[PDB]
């Protein structure tokens, strides 16, 4: 038993990173994340 | 010359005799026979040999080291009893 092997960080890390990249919460949800519009400060 | 030795010896004689008494009484021999054994043994008791137990023995090149325990030695007609002993000897 060694803690580093027991806990796998990319589970959480790459999980969230993935989700926000694709914006699919599951599909059970999609398009939740969207790249910001910098067209104009109003936009 | 050692005093602890004579004390140990005394403990041995006294301890053995009392324990042996049961068997002596069982064999229906004689209390005074037991007493004789005691007196003769102590009488006899009045060649550079050490009898003991070893904990560890090591060697490096021709150098030996030994950790001895619970023993008795007769060196130059004198008796010593010890708890521990360290031996540092050089072989050729």
């Amino acid at each position: 038993f060694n803690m580093k092997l027991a806990i796998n960080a990319k589970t959480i890390t790459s999980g969230l990173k993935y989700a926000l990249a694709t914006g699919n919460w599951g599909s059970s949800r999609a398009g939740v994340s969207q790249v910001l519009n910098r067209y104009t400060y109003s936009s | 010359s050692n005093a602890e030795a004579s004390r140990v010896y005394e403990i041995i004689v006294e301890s053995v005799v009392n324990e042996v008494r049961e068997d002596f009484e069982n064999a229906g021999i004689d209390e005074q026979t037991l007493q004789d054994l005691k007196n003769i043994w102590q009488k006899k008791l009045t060649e550079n040999l050490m009898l003991c137990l070893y904990d560890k023995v090591t060697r490096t090149k021709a150098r030996w080291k030994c950790s001895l325990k619970d023993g008795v030695v007769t060196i130059n007609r004198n008796d010593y009893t010890f708890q521990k002993a360290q031996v540092e000897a050089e072989w050729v």
């Binding site: - | 140990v8 010896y9 041995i12 053995v16 324990e19 023993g71 060196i75 010890f82 708890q83 000897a89």
Partner: protein
């Protein structure tokens, strides 16, 4: 249990000699003599374990050594022995049985 090596000691030989006499000289039950020696083996062991304080130091030339059947035999020549006094011995024979 209990090794019979201590019978070769001064106190051990004396016991042997005493018993041998009671057997031969008298008519004292042999076999019982063995029972006694079995007691001796145990007593010397516990006594040397619980009733000793001395620490010895032996330094000299190793003339001979040997090992077989859990027994180490050493023969030290021209050695100085330190009790807790300094003694010198031309030839010392050591016989040691496994503590475990």
């Amino acid at each position: 249990g209990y090794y019979e090596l201590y019978r070769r000691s001064t106190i051990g030989n004396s016991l042997v000699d005493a018993l041998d006499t009671l057997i031969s000289d008298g008519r004292i039950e042999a076999s019982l003599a063995m029972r006694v020696l079995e007691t001796f083996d145990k007593v010397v062991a516990e006594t040397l374990k619980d009733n000793t304080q001395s620490k010895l130091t032996v330094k000299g030339n190793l003339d001979t050594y040997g090992f077989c059947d859990d027994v180490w035999t050493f023969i030290v020549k021209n050695c100085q022995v330190t009790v807790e006094s300094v003694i010198s011995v031309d030839k010392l024979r050591i016989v040691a049985c496994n503590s475990k």
